């Protein structure tokens, strides 16, 4: 954290892409580490909590995932993917109430947003599987 | 942004004490601005987020305070004042659930930590109150 402070936007951007690419290739603990650092270097780029969360998810780290997602949501109240993946976390914690609120928030948030139409559906369908049960 | 980068550890510490006295003295908007500058200049220090959060409370900006304390707890799991103070904001915001977790988690970490004894009791009593 110490000597890596002060980097420019162009570098921060490329660093994220690196984390994102390792995330795709399934190198999740490496990706975690990268996002953790990025979340150290800028506490207002939802993207980095999206990434941190997702790495933890794919790691089986549901509670921890849940924490990133929740802070991200506080930082970007429009991003449907926070309440959506939180809910998949809730589901694996075996918390049906939380998963239902989450898919409901996400479906809602996602419907106003032309970019997220193909996830609004996904949330609506998860929502009615959790209804029962 | 705030090109006032590269300050020595001695200087950041007095700038921190300076925010602290502004807070103490009810100069909150001002103290707020100092803690934000500090969060943004120096390596993580919990006291920065703890002051920012505390300034926002006293200004009645509970959402904003929650962000602060929630970043604190996300990076600093064993600090109990992050969940404790977050719970307080949950109260004012109309979220009894949020408040109940916070206080309980605050109590737990707080109970183990001989230093933070009063936080333990304070978090003790708060939980009771909230349950009904």
Notes on the protein architecture:
- With 133 residues, chain A is an all-alpha fold.
- Chain A has a single domain (1-133), classed as Serine Threonine Protein Phosphatase 5, Tetratricopeptide repeat, CATH 1.25.40.10.
- Chain A contains 7 helices and no strands.
- Chain A has helices at 9-24, 28-41, 46-58, 62-75, 81-93, 96-111, 117-131.
- The longest helix of chain A has 16 residues, at 9-24.
- The radius of gyration of chain A is 15 Å and the shape is globular.
- In chain A, 39% of the residues are buried.
- Chains A and B meet through helix 4 of A and helix 4 of B.
Write down the CATH class of chain A.
Answer: Mainly Alpha
Counting helices, strands and paired strands, the structural category of chain A is mainly alpha
- Beta-strand share of residues of chain A: under 5%
Number of helices of chain A: 7
Number of strands of chain A: 0
How far apart are the first and last residues' alpha carbons of chain A, in Å? Answer: 44 Å
Q: What Rg of chain A, in angstroms, do the CA atoms define?
A: 15 Å
Protein name (chain B): Regulatory protein PcrH
């Amino acid at each position: 954290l110490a000597m890596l402070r002060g980097l420019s936007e162009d570098t921060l951007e490329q660093l994220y892409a690196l984390g994102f690419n390792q995330y795709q290739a399934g190198k999740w603990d490496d990706a975690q580490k990268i996002f953790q650092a990025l979340c150290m270097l800028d506490h207002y780029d939802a993207r980095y909590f999206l990434g941190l969360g997702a790495c933890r998810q794919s790691l089986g780290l549901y509670e921890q995932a849940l924490q990133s997602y929740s802070y991200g949501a506080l930082m970007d109240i429009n991003e449907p993917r926070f309440p959506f993946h939180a809910a998949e976390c809730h589901l694996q914690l075996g918390d049906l109430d939380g998963a239902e609120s989450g898919f409901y928030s996400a479906r809602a948030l996602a419907a106003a947003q032309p970019a997220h139409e193909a996830l609004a559906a996904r949330a609506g369908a998860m929502l009615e599987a959790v209804t029962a049960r």
